[PDB]
Amino acid sequence: EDEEYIKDTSAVISKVRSTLSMQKTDPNVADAVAELREASNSWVAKYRKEKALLGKASFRDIYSALNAVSGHYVSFGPTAPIPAKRKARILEEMETAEKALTRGR
Amino acid sequence: EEYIKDTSAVISKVRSTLSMQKTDPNVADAVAELREASNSWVAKYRKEKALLGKASFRDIYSALNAVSGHYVSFGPTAPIPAKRKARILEEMETAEKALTRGR
Numbered sequence: 001e002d003e004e005y006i007k008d009t010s011a012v013i014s015k016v017r018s019t020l021s022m023q024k025t026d027p028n029v030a031d032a033v034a035e036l037r038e039a040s041n042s043w044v045a046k047y048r049k050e051k052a053l054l055g056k057a058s059f060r061d062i063y064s065a066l067n068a069v070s071g072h073y074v075s076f077g078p079t080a081p082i083p084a085k086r087k088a089r090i091l092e093e094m095e096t097a098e099k100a101l102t103r104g105r
Numbered sequence: 106e107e108y109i110k111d112t113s114a115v116i117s118k119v120r121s122t123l124s125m126q127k128t129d130p131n132v133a134d135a136v137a138e139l140r141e142a143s144n145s146w147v148a149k150y151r152k153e154k155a156l157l158g159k160a161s162f163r164d165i166y167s168a169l170n171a172v173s174g175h176y177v178s179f180g181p182t183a184p185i186p187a188k189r190k191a192r193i194l195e196e197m198e199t200a201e202k203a204l205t206r207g208r
Contacts, residue, residue, distance in 0.1 A: 030178060034178075045147075074176075074181065075137075077180030
């Protein structure tokens with residue numbers, strides 16, 4: 001279902017924005033990061049084996065951005081701020097991916 | 106059996122990762138590799154219906170979740186607390202003894 005892919009991918013995008021936009025000292029950070037990683041794992045596990053999705057810009061861009069977020073947290077733990085230039089890049093990839101997503105791309 | 110093969114590999118990575126000293130330069134890679142194997146195992150078998158009735162699956166799932174929850178809360182260099190690490194390793198042995206017998 002394409003509508004379901006749009007709903008699920010929008011939710012993940014919102015979680016990335018929520019997690020990345022918290023204050024670096026914020027106490028909810030560890031919880032936010034944990035929820036994001038659970039959302040990311042579910043999204044990947046649901047959609048990565050769907051072959052044709054690799055042809056969607058929305059999928060490639062979200063998959064790449066989630067990997068950028070995941071790689072940072074698995075290296076440094078949940079309260080390490082993502083480097084500012086990567087954070088900017090990730091949030092920009094979220095915007096480009098969401099613009100494709102809601103056009104059915 | 107594919108499930109036995111995959112679960113043995115995960116057990117082995119848990120044992121390898123938990124046994125490393127905190128000075129080991131491979132710890133970061135080892136935790137990452139374990140996280141990846143753990144994700145692939147759960148994604149592959151949590152969907153399978155029959156397996157939640159298997160002791161090996163429940164015990165592995167539980168122990169991977171204990172490993173996961175620790176490393177999502179701390180960096181890869183933070184050791185799992187000693188008493189939990191020992192319990193995890195013991196559940197690995199229990200799970201493997203059931204796994205090898207088809208349970």
